[PDB]
RNA sequence: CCCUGGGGGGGCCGGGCCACCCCUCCCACGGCGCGACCGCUCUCCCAGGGGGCGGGGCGGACUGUCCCCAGUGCGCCCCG
């Protein structure tokens, strides 16, 4: 005798973020050389000492 | 008008214009300079190399055989 199927209306609420981005391409570019330039730190400095 | 019934020329007067020299419109094309809009990006620049669009904000996320201090995007707002 009722099968409508009545909906909750929704709306209640707006924010938007949870999870992680994409990084782009300059920003993993110089990821790296910066693990290149820190090898290389405890290459010389780590060895000559 | 000219030469011997014949011959050779000049013509008759107004109208505008392609135009002929002097002043004026709209286009087509080409060049230089200027204005603002849209789109693209980083050079002159700046603290020989080097470091970029910067700078600031609301920020917000991220990176490092770990110089924990340094580095990189993106949203917005404003000038170059």
Redesign the pocket.
């Known amino acids: 005798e009722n099968p409508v199927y009545e909906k909750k209306p929704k709306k209640e609420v707006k924010k938007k973020?949870w999870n992680?981005?994409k990084?782009?391409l300059?920003?993993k570019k110089?990821?790296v050389a910066?693990?290149k330039?820190?090898?290389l730190?405890?290459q010389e400095r780590?060895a000559e000492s």
């Open positions: 973020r992680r981005p990084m782009s300059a920003q110089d990821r910066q693990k330039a820190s090898f730190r405890a780590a």
